[PDB]
Design an enzyme around this catalytic site. Structure first.
Site, PDB file in Angstrom:
ATOM      1  N   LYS A  99       0.815  -1.238   0.000  1.00 60.85           N
ATOM      2  CA  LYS A  99       0.000   0.000   0.000  1.00 60.85           C
ATOM      3  C   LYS A  99       0.853   1.296   0.000  1.00 60.85           C
ATOM      4  O   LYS A  99       0.411   2.349  -0.487  1.00 60.85           O
ATOM      5  CB  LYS A  99      -0.764   0.026   1.345  1.00 60.85           C
ATOM      6  CG  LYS A  99      -1.841   1.031   1.261  1.00 60.85           C
ATOM      7  CD  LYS A  99      -2.719   1.009   2.566  1.00 60.85           C
ATOM      8  CE  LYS A  99      -3.807   2.096   2.403  1.00 60.85           C
ATOM      9  NZ  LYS A  99      -4.748   1.934   3.521  1.00 60.85           N
ATOM     10  N   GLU A 151       7.481  -5.560   8.394  1.00 63.26           N
ATOM     11  CA  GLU A 151       6.642  -5.038   7.329  1.00 63.26           C
ATOM     12  C   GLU A 151       7.117  -3.647   6.905  1.00 63.26           C
ATOM     13  O   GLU A 151       6.335  -2.750   6.983  1.00 63.26           O
ATOM     14  CB  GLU A 151       5.142  -5.096   7.701  1.00 63.26           C
ATOM     15  CG  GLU A 151       4.609  -6.455   8.070  1.00 63.26           C
ATOM     16  CD  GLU A 151       3.106  -6.351   8.625  1.00 63.26           C
ATOM     17  OE1 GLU A 151       2.442  -5.297   8.418  1.00 63.26           O
ATOM     18  OE2 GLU A 151       2.614  -7.284   9.340  1.00 63.26           O
ATOM     19  N   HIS A 187       3.289  -3.762  16.015  1.00 61.11           N
ATOM     20  CA  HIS A 187       3.859  -2.721  15.286  1.00 61.11           C
ATOM     21  C   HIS A 187       4.145  -1.497  16.164  1.00 61.11           C
ATOM     22  O   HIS A 187       3.228  -1.048  16.882  1.00 61.11           O
ATOM     23  CB  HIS A 187       2.798  -2.281  14.199  1.00 61.11           C
ATOM     24  CG  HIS A 187       3.112  -0.999  13.499  1.00 61.11           C
ATOM     25  ND1 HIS A 187       4.154  -0.831  12.611  1.00 61.11           N
ATOM     26  CD2 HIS A 187       2.451   0.188  13.519  1.00 61.11           C
ATOM     27  CE1 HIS A 187       4.116   0.400  12.106  1.00 61.11           C
ATOM     28  NE2 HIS A 187       3.123   1.056  12.691  1.00 61.11           N
TER      29      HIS A 187
END
Length: 394
Positions: free
Chosen positions: A62, A256, A182
């Site tokens: 994204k 990520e 995260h």
């Protein structure tokens, strides 16, 4: 699709490439354009591999889903983290295998889950019981990472709720294989990673009591790109991994990164199409409905060789399209070009009704020197690099 990549030696730099395209665009329609330094992406990956060789990165599609970027990262060996069906479909279309894809959307729809089962993407995150039951019902081979929240939008579940999610998963027959967390880039309070890793080991402990085989830890995407920021995070998590998640535990550690790879690799050039004296307001040929979408949730430099407070607005003139509320510029004129650096992340969006179906051209460059290094690692010979055509730059 072929990507022609201009090779640069040691005498020519990105300021020269921009000057060249501003000259060609002048001269012609005069569209906005990006220049992408593809060797800066390849350098980001070998930076990753030097500092954290044991953490496998799964690129956040994204951030920038332009296919030249995704093919280079695939050929360098990344996985891909996808948050929709059409991200997963784009990565599979380029030839990535489903085992290198994780489905990370915080609100998964039943037809995305059943698409994932249909194409064989098994690895996915989950932070809640209702998403858990959607996965169980619709994806019998799902391998789930429990997503724990972190104190730094915010996602992830509490530790207390993970005990309950593990019980539900046992009853629904879901394979839990790991944990995800995260931490924001912008969180320069690196101790948050200590509590995250401790919370993760606690889940890997409880899940082993339930009979799960836990083998993946995802530490998230909180990486800016700089060597110093990556080395700060590594300084904090490295001893705790060495200890809670050692070499030989068979626990794979993944991350990520997204912006990490692309943000500083692209520069955008736009031109002024209108001018209004109130102080000056300038309207540019790109805006919030194109490359500057991220403004809704990076300093303009004048391209050409007494400063006034100026605003920059995009070409829609609508209330959302003010891109820089005030900065100090020289008096500029219609047809003048402004250059924005670090425009690689959340900017490559599709032509749509809202931009009158127009998007900037994209030109690619690398130094001969970064190319030699790809050649010597064997990557330019990989079938994943088949669409790239590298030639000495004009």
């Amino acid at each position: 699709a072929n990507y022609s990549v201009g090779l640069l030696d040691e005498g020519t730099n990105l300021g020269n490439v921009i000057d060249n395209y501003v000259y060609e665009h002048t001269l012609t329609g005069k569209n906005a354009f990006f220049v992408g330094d593809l060797g800066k992406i390849v350098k980001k990956h070998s930076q990753w591999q030097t500092v954290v060789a044991q953490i496998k990165p799964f690129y956040t599609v994204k951030c920038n889903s332009t296919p030249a970027v995704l093919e280079i990262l695939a050929a360098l060996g990344t996985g891909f983290a996808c948050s929709s069906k059409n991200e997963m479909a784009l990565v599979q279309e380029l030839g990535v295998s489903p085992e290198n894809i994780i489905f990370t959307s915080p609100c998964k729809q039943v037809s995305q889950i059943k698409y994932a089962a249909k194409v064989g993407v098994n690895i996915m995150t989950c932070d809640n019981e209702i998403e858990l039951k959607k996965i169980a019902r619709n994806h019998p081979n799902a391998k789930v990472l429990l997503h724990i929240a972190t104190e730094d939008m915010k996602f992830g579940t509490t530790l207390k709720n993970c005990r309950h999610l593990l019980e539900c998963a046992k009853e629904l027959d879901v394979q839990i294989i790991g944990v995800k967390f995260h931490v924001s880039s912008a969180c320069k309070e690196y101790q948050v990673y200590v509590h995250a890793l401790s919370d993760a080991r606690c889940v890997f402990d409880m899940a082993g009591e339930f009979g799960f085989t836990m083998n993946m830890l995802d530490i998230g995407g909180g990486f800016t790109g700089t060597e110093i920021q990556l080395e700060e995070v590594n300084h904090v998590i490295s001893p705790l991994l060495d200890i809670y998640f050692p070499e030989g535990s068979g626990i794979q550690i993944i991350s990520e990164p997204g912006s990490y790879y692309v943000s500083s690799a692209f520069t955008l050039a736009v031109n002024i199409i209108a001018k209004k004296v109130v102080a000056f307001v300038y309207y540019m040929n790109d805006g919030v409905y194109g490359s500057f979408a991220s403004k809704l949730s990076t300093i303009p430099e004048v391209h050409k060789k007494p400063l006034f407070t100026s605003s920059l607005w995009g070409p829609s003139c609508d209330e959302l399209d003010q891109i820089v509320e005030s900065c100090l510029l020289p008096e500029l004129n219609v047809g003048d070009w402004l250059i924005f650096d670090n425009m690689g992340a959340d900017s490559f969006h599709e032509p749509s009704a809202f931009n009158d179906f127009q998007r900037p051209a994209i030109y690619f460059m690398m130094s001969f020197s970064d190319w030699y290094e790809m050649q010597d690692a064997g990557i330019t010979s990989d079938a994943m690099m088949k669409n790239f055509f590298f030639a000495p730059s004009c």
